[PDB]
Amino acid sequence: APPVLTVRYEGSERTFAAGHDVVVGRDLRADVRVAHPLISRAHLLLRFDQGRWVAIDNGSLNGLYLNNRRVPVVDIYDAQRVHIGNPDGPALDFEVGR
């Protein structure tokens, strides 16, 4: 029933099902690995909660940005582009559903 979440980063795609937290970050073992030094090892958590996908800033040093606003969380209803590390840091494209 819950839609899957596709994450597009720098020519890569990964697709996740609701039920376990997804890690975005610099860690070699991250589900979505982003190597730029602005990025913390476990920079974001992605998860399906209360009926929607969310991207959560996991107490990162350099943060999560939506349209030049630094935010602790981004709600992903259908489609969304965010930046991590800076307003012009690595971009993540989110897409909900198949």
Curated annotation (Swiss-Prot):
Mod. after translation: Phosphorylated by PknF. Can probably be phosphorylated in vivo by other kinases when PknF is missing.
Result after altering residue 26 to A: Strong decrease in phosphorylation
Deleted gene: phenotype: Disruption results in a growth defect in macrophage and mouse infections.
Domain FHA as annotated: residue spans: 22-71
Superkingdom of source: Bacteria
Compartments where located: Cell membrane
Domain notes: In Rv1747 the ATP-binding domain (NBD) and the transmembrane domain (TMD) are fused. The two FHA domains are required for phosphorylation by PknF.
Protein family membership: In the central section; belongs to the ABC transporter superfamily. In the C-terminal section; belongs to the ABC-2 integral membrane protein family.
Function: Involved in the translocation of an unknown substrate across the membrane. Transmembrane domains (TMD) form a pore in the membrane and the ATP-binding domain (NBD) is responsible for energy generation. Required for virulence.
SUBUNIT field: Homodimer. Interacts with PknF.
Protein name according to UniProt: ABC transporter ATP-binding/permease protein Rv1747
Organism the protein comes from: Mycobacterium tuberculosis (strain ATCC 25618 / H37Rv)
Residues included from the entire protein: 8 to 105 of 865
